[PDB]
Amino acid sequence: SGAKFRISLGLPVGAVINCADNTGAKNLYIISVKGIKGRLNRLPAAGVGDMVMATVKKGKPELRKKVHPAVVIRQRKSYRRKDGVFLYFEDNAGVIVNNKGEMKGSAITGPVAKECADLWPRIASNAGSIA
Template sequence: MIQEQTKLNVVDNSGGKVVKCIKVLKGSKKKTAKIGDFIKVVVKNSIFNSKIKKGQILNAIIVRSKFPLKRTDGSYLSFNDNAVLLLNNQNQMIGTRIFGVIAKEIKTIYFKKLISLSSELV
């Protein structure tokens, strides 16, 4: 579960390295987020000479979480780190590549491009 003040890794080539969650979106009283949810983040660490700068506020979607996710078949899925993909204000991906694996639960109408760019689905 991701909540406010959680630090997360960035798994695309947008230029950010580490971000911090400042708000969980899609609900006024929602306190935690899981894989596939949207959050608002602030960039804490970025790559030199990138378009993403430290202190910038962006949207993000969670693609990996340490907290176990229960699937419909009864199995559980958890990862070794918490990771996000950075999005712009129109909820389009900033980066053009995705590093590492992502969960199949991300498949939605809006993110068909995300599935095609990922190297492996789990």
């Protein structure tokens, strides 16, 4: 019910982010972002909690050469919360999911943003910690 607020978008189309799940992918290459209507000359961009379409560049041979739905769980670009806190992570990370938001893997490495955690209960259950 409660809607997520706008946050700074740090991951434009073309960003390679780490893969923080045990699927086998070592990184995720963003090719689009769900919900982006956009405008002329502007790259679609993503932030923690956003579902994106990505391809695996480094990882299991069976996982590559195809487009996966993924969700960004960490980003290096600091973003303001409504309690005034500017938070940023050591690295950019995502997890592969399906259309329904269920993790293709079964575990996550590293913390997950509270912004993405509250939006994806399937992702939250696998998070070791929440930032």
